């Protein structure tokens, strides 16, 4: 996530993230490449990355139940 500060900050990674945001959707539409992303902690992620036009479908992986565990073993 981005933030506001005046004593010190962390801006370079934010600029690379802004360029990545601009690559998806943005001024120039792209329709030949597909993007897959993986993570395991969503609450610390920037809301602009979770826009519907930038990341369309969201899949959640639940913990396996009894039958799934038996199948895995």
Ligand X SMILES: Nc1ncnc2c1ncn2[C@@H]1O[C@H](COP(=O)(O)OP(=O)(O)OP(=O)(O)O)[C@@H](O)[C@H]1O
User: Rule CB under 6 A: which residues touch ligand X?
Assistant: 25, 48, 51, 53
> What is the C-alpha to C-alpha distance for residues 23 and 19, in angstroms, rounded to an integer?
6
Beta carbon nearer to ligand X, 20 or 48: 48
Report the residue number, 42 or 48, with the smaller CB distance to ligand X: 48
Residue 56 touching another protein (CB under 8 A): yes
Q: How far is the CB of 57 from another protein (least distance, A)?
A: 6
Residues 6+ apart with CB under 8 A from 54: 21, 24, 25, 48
């Amino acid at each position: 996530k981005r933030f506001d500060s005046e004593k010190a900050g962390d801006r370079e990674v934010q600029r690379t993230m802004l360029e990545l945001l601009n690559q998806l959707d943005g001024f120039q539409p792209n329709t030949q490449v597909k993007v897959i992303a993986a993570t395991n902690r969503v609450d610390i992620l920037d809301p602009a990355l979770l826009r519907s036009g930038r990341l369309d479908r969201k899949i959640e992986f639940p913990m396996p139940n009894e039958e799934a565990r038996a199948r895995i073993m």
